[model samples]
Target: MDEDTEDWETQLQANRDEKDRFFSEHRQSPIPPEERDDFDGLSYFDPDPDYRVEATVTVHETPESVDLETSDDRTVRYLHVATLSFDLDGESRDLHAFRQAADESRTLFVPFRDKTTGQQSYDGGRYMELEPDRDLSDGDEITLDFNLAYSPFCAYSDTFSCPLPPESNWLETAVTAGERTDLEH
Candidate 1:
């Protein structure tokens, strides 16, 4: 395998081993206890990872001009529907673009900044830039799992104008899987 792939596999294995070890030692680490004992007995398992399952996300159409501007003052435009949805804080947030189409270019952007930054995944929030879908048949949908949520570029080492997801994108509920906070001290 290539060095890059090999390195990643090694890291992944190490993480799995660490978690397994933690689980073995702390059965109560991953759940909320009826008694207010350690960690204040907070329920970190609201949107628990164990509760995650594959879901058919509903895609909404955004304006063709919906885009983000770069720190260098460059604007990117989106021209098609590439919306996605997931239950967060008990609500379904629709990712529809508000800008109207005015350019010939189209881009798909997924605004997601998960719990893992500078810890598990890359610091910068992961993106899924794709060309507009042409075959949105039966329905516009795709499988969205926390497994894809990643760190914001800022998490890696800083030096990036990593755009944080808007306040609306914040999950009031704990997103229990994929990545975890870097546990800033």
Candidate 2:
């Protein structure tokens, strides 16, 4: 493997290790206390570099309000701040990025579902957050790493009310990276 690929794999492994430790020992972990004892760790697809794709950002001058349905049959409001367009699996794909309407954080929430959603990954969908170093423009390029996609807290426990990925963010192709739903809650 190339040097950059090796470094990325190493970092991804470290992140996964830290997450395992948190889920195993942290009090605020999404894994329930009762199940932590038997929790081996989260299962993930091999760290394939192909899943990390560069996307062009299209910033919204006037963000649109969107109400995403939650796992508990409720809705949470957010602002559609941007659209990330990229090519994956030899096809063009796009996902909408949002942020909480009341929050001013720079982190952009990207929740999505692929063909593997219910069978391989979480039923509700997986999420990724992008925190740009500075404000983005219409043509800004950013990395959208599916290898870093993760299941929401609600996937582990029912106490959490996580926002479901909107239909617009759903991808028709199977994304064979990131966390897999091998652990039975």
Candidate 3:
């Protein structure tokens, strides 16, 4: 592997290791206390660079309000502020990005489900967040790294209510990167 790839892998490993430690020892961890004793660590696919792609941003001049169902029986509202267009596995794909309707934060929330959702990853889907240095404009390029995708807190405990990915963000292709479901649990 090239030096840059090796460095990226090293950092990713460190991040995963820290998350494992938190899940195992942190009092506020998402893992239920009763299950912590048996918890090992999160399962993840090998670091594949193919999952990291550059996307063309399409900013919505008038963000549209979207209602997303939660893992629990409630709903959360967000503003669909942007769309990320890219190609994966040679097929063109697009994912809608949102921001909490009441917040002014620049961070973009991207929750999605793919072919691997029910089979190898979280059935509730996985999430990826992006914090652009500045406001996004149409045609701007940004990196969508699936390798950083993760299961929401609700996946580990019932106490947390997490938003479910809407169908508009679903990808037909399997994204075999980031966290995988621990079926044994």
Candidate 4:
């Protein structure tokens, strides 16, 4: 592998190890306290370089309020602020990204499902949050590292109420990356 790729892999391994340690030691870990004694690190798909893609941003001139359903049948409000379009494995796709309706934060939330849902990955879905270093424009490009996608807290325990990805964000292809279902581990 190239030096850049090798460095990325090294960082990924370090992150996974740190997360494992935190889950085992932190009181705020999503893993149930009763299961921490026997808890193992999270399972992930092999880090495929292809899962990282560059997406073109399309800012919404007039953002709309969206209510996403949570795991426990509750709703949460967000602003559908932008759409990101990119090509993955020869197929073109677009995903609606959001921000909290009540916040002024610039963080972008991207929650999605793929063909792996309920088979290889979490049944509910996975998420990626991006904080741009500067303001993003309609034509700006952003890197989406799907290898960093992860399950919401609700996937680890029923005590959390995580928002479910909307059908509009579902992909017809299997992502084959990121965190897999707990059963798969």
Candidate 5:
């Protein structure tokens, strides 16, 4: 593999290892206590470079407050700060990202859905949070690695109230990357 690909693969493995460690040893792990005895690592698609793509970000100066429904039927308000426009397999697509509140943090929370929903992956959808290392502008190109997408904690147990991706985030194509349905759980 090329240097950049090799580096990303290595980083992906490290992230997986860290996640597995948390599930196996952390007291607040999403895995149920009863299932921890035989819990295995979560399932994910094999790493593919095609899953990573560049996107142009469009920031909303006056963010809108959107109430997204959670797994437990509760609504949480978030500020729609930006929309990330990108392409996958020649088709154009976009995703709206949000923050818990307008000025709560810089982290951009992105929850999304695809054709894999309720099939290969969790029915509730997957998420990718972006924390820009440098300030981004309207046309700043950012790499979105779908391989890093993950199912919410609610996918493992009902105790967690995870926010479901809204209709706006649904993609027409099947995103065969990232964490899949955890059949073992």
Candidate 6:
């Protein structure tokens, strides 16, 4: 195999190993009430294991290159916010139904304040492309993977104008997956 292919395989293996460790020692890290603001994240959550959460599509509205700044002065493009859910996990929450200030013309914003936003997740809200490869009629399901979740650009510093999620998208559950913020606070 070429060097590039070998590099990819090696990285994949390392990622898998890291994931195995986290899940194997799955322990919920509670955010203290005082420290909650410090975390400034969405509520705790876990993807409903029974759902399919990915669809390939060409978003007619939000282009892949659409770029915008966050409320904290970071630049990010509103590719497409994911509009998907899965009841396969017993009873899942369909996030697409929630109220948000976004559209096809602008960024499909899905800013969420989770249980670990400032510290564990994106403080300004992790960015997601509502990549619409096909219509919902085509059985488009969301492939929610925490491994790919990341902090928004605002997480670095505050200056950009980020459109926060309406109060509706807040998840009552904890999102245990995704990249954590590296702050000394």
CA lDDT of every candidate: 0.39, 0.70, 0.69, 0.68, 0.68, 0.42
Which structure is stronger by TM-score: 1 or 5? 5
Q: Look at candidate 2 and tell me the lDDT of residue 94.
A: 89
Q: Pick the candidate with the highest lDDT.
A: 2
Q: Candidate 4: lDDT of 104? A: 51
Tens-digit lDDT track of model 3 for 1-185: 37766766665677667656644465345545655577545444555678878899998889877765433434678888789998887877888888777455566888777887667765767677666557788989876878777555666666666575667788887887645665455
**Residue 181 displacement in candidate 2 (angstroms):** 2.3
lDDT score for candidate 4 against the true structure: 0.68
Which candidate do you rate higher for lDDT, 2 or 5? 2
Q: Return the candidate ranking by TM-score, descending.
A: 5, 2, 3, 4, 6, 1
In model 3, pairs of residues that clash are none
Error of 5 at 115 (Å): 1.2
Error of 5 at 166 (Å): 3.5
lDDT score, residue 86, model 6?
A: 44
Model 2 Cα lDDT, one tens digit per residue, 1-185: 48766776666677677656654465345655665577545445556678888899998989888765333434578888789999987888888988777455566778777877667765767676665556667989877877767556666676666675667788888888645665444
Model 2, position 174: C-alpha lDDT score: 83
Q: Name the candidate, 1 or 2, with the larger lDDT value.
A: 2
CA RMSD per model (angstroms): 13.5, 4.0, 4.1, 4.1, 3.8, 11.0
Candidate 4 on 131-176: residue-level lDDT in tens?
5546677898876767777545666676566675667778888887
Question: Which sections of candidate 2 miss by over 4 Å?
Answer: 1-27, 40-46, 67-76, 101-105, 183-185
| Model 5: colliding residue pairs | none
Q: Cα RMSD for candidate 3?
A: 4.1
Please provide TM-scores, in order, for all candidate models, with all chains considered together.
Answer: 0.41, 0.75, 0.74, 0.73, 0.75, 0.44
Winner by TM-score between candidate 6 and candidate 1: 6
